[PDB]
Structures are given as C-alpha cells and as structure tokens.
Design a protein around this ligand. Sequence first.
Ligand SMILES: CN1C(=O)c2ccccc2[C@@H]1O
Ligand SMILES: [Mg+2]
Lengths: 152, 152
Amino acid sequence: PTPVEEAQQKTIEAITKAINYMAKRRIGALLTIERDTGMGDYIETGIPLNAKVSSELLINIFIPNTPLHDGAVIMKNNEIAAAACYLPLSESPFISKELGTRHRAAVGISEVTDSLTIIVSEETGGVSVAKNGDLHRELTEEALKEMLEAEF
Amino acid sequence: TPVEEAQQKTIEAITKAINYMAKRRIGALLTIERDTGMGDYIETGIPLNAKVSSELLINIFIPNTPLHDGAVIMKNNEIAAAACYLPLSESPFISKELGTRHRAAVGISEVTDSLTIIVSEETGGVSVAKNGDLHRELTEEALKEMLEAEFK
Ligand SMILES: CN1C(=O)c2ccccc2[C@@H]1O
Ligand SMILES: [Mg+2]
C-alpha cells in the first residue's frame, strides 16, 4: 500500500472509532468530509483547527455543551480543517420529519457538493450519511466503514 | 508586526481558556515549549499540530474525555499534542495539598526552560511552573504578565 493509502486507512479508522463511540453514548455529531468540490466558504465559518485527525479529537469536539460541539466539523483529507461550521439547511421532503437541524444541514451541504457527511442522532444514536442529496439512515458499523472505504 | 500580533492572539486565547476552566474548576495542564526541545514528551501524546483557539483548549480539557488526561504541549504557536506525559517532580517544597498535575508541571520545569500553566480541579486556582518553582494563586493579570514576560 502507498503512504497515501495507509494514511487514508488510518483516517477511516479514526472516524469510525469516533462515530461508534458517539453513537453508543447518543452524542450528536455532524462530520463532513470534503471531496472534489471545495468547501472553503463553509470551513471559513467555523473555528480553524487544521489539526491532525484522531478519534480522540473528534470525540472531544462533539461533547455536549462545549464550545466546539454545535455545527459541523469539516475534514480535508487527513485533517480536521475547522469545527462549529455552518452548513446550509436542506428543504428536501425526503428528510424524515422527526429529524433535526444536524440532518437537514448534512443533506443541505450534500446538495451543493460531492462531500460525504456523517450524522449521529442525539435522540436515537442512529448513524446516517448524506451524499448527493440523499440521506441513508440507521447504518451498521460495517456499512459506514464500507461507505468510507468506497469514498476513497 | 505579524509575529507580534500572532503572539498576542495566542496569549488571549490561552487566558480566555484558563479563565473558563478556573471558573468551572476544570483541571488543566498546558506546557509552552521554549528553547529546550520537548519532542520526547510531545511524542507521548496524541498528535494535533492544531491552531490555537480558546475553544479548542476548552474542548481538550473537558473532564472524562479522551484528551483531558495529561498535558497539552504548545510549540511554535500551535498545539503540538495533547494527553502528553510529563515527569513528576520529587521536590519536597511543593505545597503538600497539591497533587500530580502540579507535580508534573514542576517536574517538566526542572529539566526545561518551558512555562507550564496549571488549573486546579479542587479550587480552580491558576498556577505557573518555571525553573523548578510553582507560582500559585495567580490573578488574570498576573498570568498575562508572565506570558508576556516569557515571550519578551
Ligand atoms: C511562538 N509562540 C508560542 O509558542 C506561544 C505560546 C503561548 C503564547 C504565545 C506564544 C508565542 O506566540
Ligand atoms: Mg434501512
């Protein structure tokens, strides 16, 4: 495997470990992975981190009632670019009516970029992904990891 | 100058984070590397290489989270790593009511020219370790003066 591929695998491991931990504890989270459409306009709305990824940092960011927990984390490649970022809210009628702003923001960014966004519900602990305007709910750990692997 | 503006922005972020943690009696340990290299201690923690912000510093030290156990080490105006090991002082001249956070700060200050800030989880008191001594019960103005003097 090349260094790029190994770095990708480490980043996917860090993300899945963090999401799994947050899902178990019903810690709401919103994590957007930039792909080929640049997200600088949204990154610039948040608090700049430009930090190396770790499962530990991702978890610490989303702890309830902390400065960084509200809004999206946006990742670029192997870095956490910014936290507490704004994303546009989708008006799609295919978002389950019981879902709140984190899911609507995720679908919203996925309507205007090729990004992949992961959402942890604070209500149920369910994990979903938004991509290309569609929300896929109730993912197993295996499904999320396979989705991430395919995105890279 | 740009360098001077950056130093002041960093001092302001630190003092804001320390004030929040003192108020809530959140234990914290923040070492600022100076001329003595601290790579061996940075390597024991979780890598961040992150931009400083008061928000990130607060999020790191929230109790019962992955990153809060150990020291943050700053280097070149960034957060190099969190949850780092520091050596415990064996000095018999540290106030006997203080525990391992303060002994770790004094310990690193015995073998480096670094400046360490400590927030007590028992009292919210703020102290600074330098040169093997611990300066206790600092006001906001005192801590700022120490940070400005360190960098002058
Ligand atoms: C180069 N500098 C640092 O590493 C630092 C840390 C805290 C306050 C100020 C500074 C300074 O800007
Ligand atoms: Mg289903």
